[PDB]
């Protein structure tokens, strides 16, 4: 019935600002690999990324990384709008600011260490008011894009200078820090995490459904195993990904 | 040299002597031709200075390569504390020294605390 065709799913390959699409259908989306693609999420926000094809991806859903998902404010299993946009505009002196409480991890010069190694030949399209995560120095720092010569978004190219601020600015509180735990941080268990996600999806991801239907969802789950197996990780990730309010009742 | 403390062992005892006065300055090599001035009046040493009667690596022997493991374990957290604030990693914050009683575990703890400069606090079991 003319669906949105775009769904949220976990990302298998290590990459940021990259979205995978099912190989069986290329004409539906009318976009093959290596092209800027716009995506509308919720609360009147959109993002731009690059699209590729993955044989393992299910046609129903579109695999996407957690950084882009946080940018859109969508969650796993959600449905959003996709728009193939071959058009893309370069930028001029793309602006970036330190965001959130991430601070004291850099001394003296602070732009050559993190931004330069990542935006060099990456061609990652940056949009106004998005946070992107940079990994380095045994640390992870999320950078906000507050200012940009072109609007609303521009594809970064190796011909635009970078404006230097070096002054961290507190990010809006409703936004979720990417340093928090997620599905990616929880590995080694594989198909138990799938069972817990299926177990917890409807009660938390679709709460109003159970009020209009008479059935009992699982309200008690015993994660058991040797200490250090990530049970607390699983609980925290399920709470964060589903948006549920996580409360910790420590044994002692 | 002027204003240094040197330890003398004898009489089943150890006494640290301060060099407060000296004809040449700032330091002089002692030779068997210089008289010794006699005072015999002990004087309290400056408090910030650490008494050498306190425990150290030398007082802890017989274990060898366990003390090396503990020193490596505790160096960065205590010897280089500011490093961990600028780098995101967790140093060892809990170490269980276990063994037969009288093996010097308290010695190891005190020596590590003194050598690294950390403030040692004793939570006695009973
Ligand atoms: N399967 C795993 N995948 C990724 N990290 C893990 C995993 N298991 C344990 N860890 C790491 O070990 C830490 C301690 O495990 P944790 O889950 O908190 O204790 P417990 O298993 O008793 O609930 C975790 O904070 C996490 O960083
Ligand atoms: N390996 C050792 N090297 C030098 N002295 C030791 C050693 N082990 C024990 N001692 C001496 O025996 C005393 C008692 O040992 P102590 O470490 O205080 O008790 P515990 O092993 O229960 O912690 C120490 O004060 C120390 O003088």
UniProtKB/Swiss-Prot annotation, chain A:
GO MF annotations in UniProt: ADP binding; ATP binding; ATP hydrolysis activity; BAT3 complex binding; deubiquitinase activator activity; identical protein binding; K48-linked polyubiquitin modification-dependent protein binding; lipid binding
Please give the chief subcellular localization of this protein: cytoplasm
Q: Which GO terms describe its cellular component?
A: ATPase complex; azurophil granule lumen; ciliary basal body; cytoplasm; cytoplasmic stress granule; cytosol; Derlin-1 retrotranslocation complex; endoplasmic reticulum
Q: Which residues form a coiled coil?
A: none
Effect caused by changing residue 66 to A: Strongly increased affinity for ATP. Strongly reduced affinity for ADP
Sequence positions bearing Phosphoserine: 17
Q: What is the effect of changing residue 231 to Q?
A: Impairs ERAD degradation of HMGCR and does not inhibit interaction with RHBDD1
> In UniProt terms, what is the effect of altering residue 165 to K?
In CMT2Y; normal ATPase activity; impaired autophagic function
Please tell me where ATP 1 binds in this chain: 227-233
> What's the effect of swapping residue 163 to W?
Severely reduced binding to DERL1
What about PTM?
A: Phosphorylated by tyrosine kinases in response to T-cell antigen receptor activation. Phosphorylated in mitotic cells.
What family is this protein classified in? Answer: Belongs to the AAA ATPase family.
* Annotated disease: Inclusion body myopathy with early-onset Paget disease with or without frontotemporal dementia 1: An autosomal dominant disease characterized by disabling muscle weakness clinically resembling to limb girdle muscular dystrophy, osteolytic bone lesions consistent with Paget disease, and premature frontotemporal dementia. Clinical features show incomplete penetrance.
Q: What is known of its domains?
A: The PIM (PUB-interaction motif) motif mediates interaction with the PUB domain of RNF31.
Report the protein name in the record. Transitional endoplasmic reticulum ATPase
Give the originating organism. Answer: Homo sapiens (Human)
UniProtKB/Swiss-Prot annotation, chain B:
Result for mutant: residue 37 to W: Severely reduced binding to DERL1
PTM note: Phosphorylated by tyrosine kinases in response to T-cell antigen receptor activation. Phosphorylated in mitotic cells.
Its transmembrane ranges are: none
**Positions that bind ATP 1:** 101-107
Family note = Belongs to the AAA ATPase family.
Instruction: Name the job this protein performs.
Output: Necessary for the fragmentation of Golgi stacks during mitosis and for their reassembly after mitosis. Involved in the formation of the transitional endoplasmic reticulum (tER). The transfer of membranes from the endoplasmic reticulum to the Golgi apparatus occurs via 50-70 nm transition vesicles which derive from part-rough, part-smooth transitional elements of the endoplasmic reticulum (tER). Vesicle budding from the tER is an ATP-dependent process.
This protein's assembly is summarised as: Homohexamer. Forms a ring-shaped particle of 12.5 nm diameter, that displays 6-fold radial symmetry. Part of a ternary complex containing STX5A, NSFL1C and VCP. NSFL1C forms a homotrimer that binds to one end of a VCP homohexamer. The complex binds to membranes enriched in phosphatidylethanolamine-containing lipids and promotes Golgi membrane fusion. Binds to a heterodimer of NPLOC4 and UFD1, binding to this heterodimer inhibits Golgi-membrane fusion. Interaction with VCIP135 leads to dissociation of the complex via ATP hydrolysis by VCP.
Q: What is this protein called?
A: Transitional endoplasmic reticulum ATPase
Q: Which residues of the full protein are shown?
A: 147 to 272 of 806
